[PDB]
From a paper:
Here we present aficamten, a selective small-molecule inhibitor of cardiac myosin that diminishes ATPase activity by strongly slowing phosphate release, stabilizing a weak actin-binding state. Binding to an allosteric site on the myosin catalytic domain distinct from mavacamten, aficamten prevents the conformational changes necessary to enter the strongly actin-bound force-generating state. In doing so, aficamten reduces the number of functional myosin heads driving sarcomere shortening. The crystal structure of aficamten bound to cardiac myosin in the pre-powerstroke state provides a basis for understanding its selectivity over smooth and fast skeletal muscle.
To better define the mechanism of action of aficamten and to explain its specificity for β-MHC, we co-crystallized β-MHC with aficamten and Mg.ADP.Vanadate. The electron density map unambiguously identified the position of aficamten and the nucleotide in both molecules. As suspected from competition assays, aficamten targets the same pocket as blebbistatin, located between the U50 (upper 50 kDa) and the L50 (lower 50 kDa) subdomains in close vicinity to the inorganic phosphate (Pi)-release backdoor. A more detailed analysis of the pocket shows that most of the interactions are hydrophobic in nature with only two electrostatic interactions. The first electrostatic bond involves the carboxyl group of the L267 main chain that forms a hydrogen bond with the N–H moiety from the amide bond between the pyrazole and indane of aficamten. The second electrostatic interaction involves a hydrogen bond network between a water molecule with the nitrogen from the imidazole of H651 and a side chain NH2 of N654 of β-MHC and nitrogen 4 of the oxadiazole from aficamten. Despite binding to the same site as the nonselective inhibitor blebbistatin, notably aficamten is selective for cardiac β-MHC relative to smooth and fast skeletal muscle myosin. Specificity is likely achieved through the above-mentioned second electrostatic interaction involving a water-mediated hydrogen bond to residues CarH651 and CarN654 of β-MHC and nitrogen 4 of the oxadiazole from aficamten. Inhibition of ATPase activity by the compounds results from prevention of rearrangements of the myosin internal cleft, which are required to change the actin interface and thus the release of the hydrolysis products.
Residue numbers in the entry: 33 to 201, 211 to 369, 371 to 625, 645 to 731, 736 to 782
Write the structure that this text describes.
């Protein structure tokens, strides 16, 4: 009835209510919690009829507003219906539990199904991108958005699983078996426990799934972006180092502990035990087996696996190396056991490593001079080297996985799946958090441009009568602040080329250029107990307080080139190969990666999947209404649905239209492909307002095409 509505609520955003009376521009209502409320007319939103309950596509709702969307999602989620269409894109809510929706019977049933003839699913997104790839002969992209913990990695792995299982119907196993095992292997080394996610991705990735001209699974490749090197040697209070360290220490493979000359205790290793060492949801012993098996399935040799294990163990001993001041400021080893162990594993000479660390060489023409190092300088250098070998080993692994994923099958098109590290806010936000949050901001803007800009531009260039709608979805100001010349990165990069520059001159340069000048740049909110911040940035998903200490060193990433030389001359083949090519700042590389990805993505047909984290307590089935609403708001879910309802989501070239639908009325076209389409459409018993004629394509309102498709099925049968 007109009695069933939604009213704004302080704690739950919106609550259901029954209108009791209407007077003086005000509505009196009882809120389905029993509260009797009086609100203004403009605040009361209509409930959709029971026939629209748990609707699969929210673009079909009679009333479209925030609580209509929120409650449709909540009701579907309560029935463990975790995917929902929102116009031409999909929304998914993290169930925080295994559901029986991803088995091989489910994958087989989705094969070739049109979006509307199957329930909302990641398999349907995957299949429909495959159908467009073969129909349009163009590359596709599956762009999975969300904050840390929302389910991007899970959905990425489900898209891969779909094509590998479909295909099933240079290593140990088949291409299908190897594509499935790539992620367990990368995750042991590139994922870690943070406060928001027990298995947080500490690298971004773009996986291309290659197909031949006829659509047969040909190959796959992975590109990874800026692994969080700092985690190797440093952890905040409620986080862990990379999974692998704890997987090895689990003692599930006693032969590994012996080979690496390590104990079973993570607290004996300084680099890996600054935060937490166990995760309730993770069995590190079983995970070690899964990692080891993944390397086998990917055709890694025993020599390649043992070298990765040895280098992981050597990083552990490297962190335990003690230094003291030389009695007379110059540092000297305070023991040699830990260096001897790490040198043995790294195929180096212990005495050479220690002398290279304390006394690095400075080139003076064709002569050299030893540079002095204090204890702080040595422990910094020792940390920088450990990060470099780890990151280089991870990059080597990705290259090695790619080599096995290369088959002798030709490639025509691909479906690329993007899985970035999601938006996050820690108590301490450093350079990593800026790089991560800037990527999320860029990916949201890619969505805004595609959905709101390119869409309305398409109507304009095709001569469709259209009034431009400003959806309030434009992040160009914040993006420009971070990436354009004289922005945050540009200033950091410039401060990098100055020897007298400090964290405070870089801070001063940021303030002098942007405080009260750039709207998205603000002064921070520092609270008692919580860490100190230097500036705050207004991102799409919230304001983030950034601490700029160490950003100049983080951006330059300097290495002791004397011990890098020793790595190059190592008797361990892998270590020498890791530093073989050793001779840009990390922000310049980040901007380059992003620019390259964004231009390459505009040459693909994108498919958006919006992952939503339901709560902060990893609780299955519980919705924190303000947290879901915030994510739907900053994602532009409502606006994205509005353009599907207000605009013309489908369009077909006249020639392709005349061909496919002549069967609906052959007497109409027994003449030009446009005249044919015009006479064909005009002769059919449809709402002639549901379509518009453009310069090259016929444009359709949501629903007209499906009806035309039903009509084509009836006639062929
Ligand atoms: N569809 C899903 N089904 C089951 N568990 C899921 C699903 N999506 C996410 N999860 C859970 O949420 C956690 C965080 O999800 P993940 O995909 O790693 O997030 P992110 O977006 O940070 O990459 C996972 O470890 C898993 O326990
Ligand atoms: C280009 C598309 C893209 N970038 C990413 C990404 C970008 C940065 C980072 C992470 C992911 C997850 C970890 C973080 N790393 C750093 O900040 C960082 C800082 N110093 N180094 C060496 C790395 N995902 O997707
Ligand atoms: O927790 V995440 O995988 O989004 O980084
Ligand atoms: Mg992830």
């Amino acid at each position: 009835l007109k009695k069933d509505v939604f009213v704004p609520d302080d704690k739950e955003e919106f609550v259901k209510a029954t209108i009791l009376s209407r007077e003086g521009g005000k509505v009196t209502a009882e809120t389905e919690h029993g509260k009797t409320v009086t609100v203004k007319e403009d605040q009361v939103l209509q409930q959709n009829p029971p026939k629209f309950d748990k609707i699969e596509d929210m673009a079909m709702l009679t009333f479209l507003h925030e609580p209509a969307v929120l409650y449709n999602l909540k009701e579907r989620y309560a029935s463990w219906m975790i995917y929902t269409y929102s116009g031409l894109f999909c929304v998914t809510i993290n169930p925080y539990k295994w559901l029986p929706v991803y088995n091989a019977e489910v994958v087989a049933a989705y094969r070739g199904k049109k979006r509307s003839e199957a329930p909302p699913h990641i398999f349907s997104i995957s299949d429909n991108a495959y159908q467009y790839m073969l129909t349009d002969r163009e590359n596709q992209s599956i762009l999975i958005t969300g904050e840390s913990g929302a389910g991007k990695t899970v959905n990425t792995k489900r898209v891969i699983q779909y094509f590998a299982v479909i295909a099933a119907i240079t290593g140990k196993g088949t291409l299908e078996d190897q594509i499935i095992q790539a992620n367990p292997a990368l995750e042991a080394f590139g994922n870690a426990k943070t406060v928001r996610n027990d298995n947080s991705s500490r690298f971004g990735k773009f996986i291309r799934i290659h197909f031949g001209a006829t659509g047969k699974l040909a190959s796959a490749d992975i590109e990874t972006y800026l692994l969080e090197k700092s985690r190797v040697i440093f952890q905040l209070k409620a986080e862990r180092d990379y999974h692998i360290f704890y997987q090895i220490l689990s003692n599930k493979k006693p032969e590994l502990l012996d080979m690496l000359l390590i104990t079973n205790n993570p607290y004996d290793y300084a680099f890996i035990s600054q935060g937490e060492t166990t995760v309730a949801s993770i069995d590190d012993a079983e995970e070690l087996m899964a990692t080891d098996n993944a390397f086998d399935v990917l055709g890694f040799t025993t020599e390649e696996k043992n070298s990765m294990y040895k280098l992981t163990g050597a990083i552990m001993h490297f962190g335990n190396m003690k230094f003291k001041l030389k009695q007379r400021e110059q540092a000297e080893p305070d023991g040699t056991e830990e260096a001897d162990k790490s040198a043995y594993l790294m195929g180096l000479n212990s005495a050479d490593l220690l002398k290279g660390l304390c006394h690095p060489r400075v080139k003076v023409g064709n002569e050299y001079v030893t540079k002095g190092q204090n204890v702080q300088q040595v422990v910094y250098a020792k940390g920088a080297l450990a990060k470099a070998v780890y990151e280089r080993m991870f990059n080597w692994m990705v290259t090695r996985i790619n080599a096995t994923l290369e088959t002798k099958q030709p490639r025509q098109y691909f479906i690329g799946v993007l899985d970035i590290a999601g938006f996050e806010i820690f108590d301490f936000n450093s350079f990593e958090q800026l790089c991560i949050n800037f990527t999320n901001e860029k990916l949201q803007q890619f969505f805004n441009h595609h959905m709101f800009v390119l869409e309305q531009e398409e109507y304009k260039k095709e001569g469709i009568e259209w009034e431009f709608i400003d959806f309030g979805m434009d992040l160009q100001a914040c993006i420009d602040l971070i990436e354009k010349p004289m922005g945050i990165m540009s200033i950091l990069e410039e401060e990098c080329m100055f020897p007298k520059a400090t964290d405070m001159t870089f801070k001063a340069k940021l303030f002098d250029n942007h405080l009260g000048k750039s709207s998205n740049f603000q002064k921070p909110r520092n609270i008692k107990g919580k860490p100190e911040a230097h500036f705050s940035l207004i991102h799409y998903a919230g304001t983030v307080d950034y601490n700029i200490i160490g950003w100049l060193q983080k951006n330059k990433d300097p290495l002791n080139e004397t011990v890098v030389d020793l790595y190059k001359k190592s008797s361990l083949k892998m270590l020498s190969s890791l530093f073989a090519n050793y001779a840009q700042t990390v922000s310049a590389l980040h901007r380059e990666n992003l620019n390259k990805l964004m231009t390459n993505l505009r040459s693909t047909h994108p498919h958006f999947v919006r992952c939503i984290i339901p709560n902060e307590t990893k609780s299955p089935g519980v919705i924190d209404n303000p947290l879901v609403m915030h994510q739907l708001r900053c994602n532009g879910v409502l606006e994205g649905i509005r353009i599907c309802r207000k605009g013309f989501p489908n369009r077909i070239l006249y020639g392709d239209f005349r061909q496919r639908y002549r069967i609906l009325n052959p007497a109409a076209i027994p003449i030009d492909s446009r005249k044919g389409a015009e006479k064909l459409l005009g002769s059919l018993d449809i709402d002639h307002n549901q379509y518009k004629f453009g310069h090259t394509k016929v444009f359709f309102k949501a629903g007209l095409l499906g009806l035309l498709e039903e009509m084509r099925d009836e006639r062929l049968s």
